[PDB]
Amino acid sequence: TMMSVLANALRTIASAERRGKRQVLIRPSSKVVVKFLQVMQKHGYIGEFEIIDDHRAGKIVVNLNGRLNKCGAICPRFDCATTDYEKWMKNILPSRQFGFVVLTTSLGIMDHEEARSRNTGGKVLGFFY
């Protein structure tokens, strides 16, 4: 019973970053798991993927460069109006400098900083410091 396929995905990345692994192999890839990872990769927290075809649901193989402290998923996916970036910045991120909160917006999966500038709000997905 895989309820959220990000929950399973970003834990593995999280809990295999805490062990210093060079690579992680993630069980059910999905359109959201990729778009989330490609945001991690934009800011330098992950090296590379392989998305392997099983013909059913892929298997992502991520190269870790050692720079992730944590990866969450926020499970119920609460909303954000663009005025609510300050709650999430405040509660879930360590400092007001270096964290990132990842959202789904009309425009897509993007950072809370890519969202403030485009003015969309959306639903929260997770974070990474």
Partner: protein, 200 residues
């Protein structure tokens, strides 16, 4: 009209092209009994177009479009036609690509549920590999996603088949781009089962 002009699509029977004629003839000669077993599937068959594509290296490619109605014909014969269409035309590679419509993404939840999956892009563009590559198989796919943001497909043929198709792939890689406007890179792998990219 002329006996070999019934190997084209009817619009192009009136005013064919210097390209479209020369396969028409060649398809006809082979329609006419010459090749055993293609005496079997000559007569019901047609061509829509053909296009000349020049890869940036060496030999041109004539991309012969025929209507999807004929796949199950050609898949039997496809190894024979291309071989014996190339003898007829020296110095250019002959590829056989059925023609397919692609419905745009609907955007309505209620329309997405009505779309023929075989008319969707991902399904179409795949069959435009299997057409360029046939009889050989796609053993694996991988999408390599690189820090740049680049995502690149890798399609793994059998190694048993290395000897025939190696020479064609730089073209097949390129033609595919011109048809799809997507990109492909090939590698081979031997036990396809245990997945080991051949290097040797």
């Amino acid at each position: 009209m002329q006996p070999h002009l019934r190997k084209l699509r009817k619009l192009k029977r009136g005013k064919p092209s210097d390209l479209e004629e020369s396969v028409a003839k060649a398809l006809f000669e082979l329609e006419a009994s010459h090749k055993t077993l293609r005496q079997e599937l000559p007569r019901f068959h047609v061509n829509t177009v053909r296009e000349v594509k020049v890869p940036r290296s060496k030999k041109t490619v004539l991309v012969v479009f025929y209507p999807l109605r004929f796949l199950m014909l050609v898949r039997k014969v496809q190894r024979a036609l291309t071989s014996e269409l190339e003898k007829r035309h020296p110095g250019c590679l002959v590829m056989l690509v059925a023609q397919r419509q692609i419905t745009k993404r609907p955007t309505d939840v209620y329309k997405l549920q009505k779309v023929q999956r075989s008319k969707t892009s991902t399904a179409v563009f795949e069959n435009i590999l299997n057409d360029m590559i046939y009889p050989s198989d796609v053993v694996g796919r991988r999408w390599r996603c690189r820090t740049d943001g680049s995502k690149l497909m890798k399609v793994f043929l059998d190694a048993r088949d290395r000897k025939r198709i190696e020479s064609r792939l730089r073209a097949v890689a390129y033609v595919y781009k011109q048809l799809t406007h997507r990109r492909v890179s090939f590698g081979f792998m031997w036990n396809p089962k245990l997945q080991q990219v051949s290097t040797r």
